[PDB]
Amino acid sequence: VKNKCVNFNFNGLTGTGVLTKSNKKFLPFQQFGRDIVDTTDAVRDPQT
């Protein structure tokens, strides 16, 4: 479910927030996202 505050457990990564589509350029080996503050920003969907 996207655009709605939910609890996610993406591949064991637990957390809460809102998810949606993106226009990133995740390299094929990339799996996570972050910022200069080292906070999980983007998660690649395991089944999508």
Partner: peptide, 24 residues
């Protein structure tokens, strides 16, 4: 056979340490 001539490396041989996307 083979040789063992030595050269310089310059800025080369840097790999993505993790699989965490980052930008700017």
């Amino acid at each position: 056979t083979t040789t063992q001539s030595y050269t310089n490396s310059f800025t080369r041989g840097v790999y993505y340490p993790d699989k965490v996307f980052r930008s700017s």
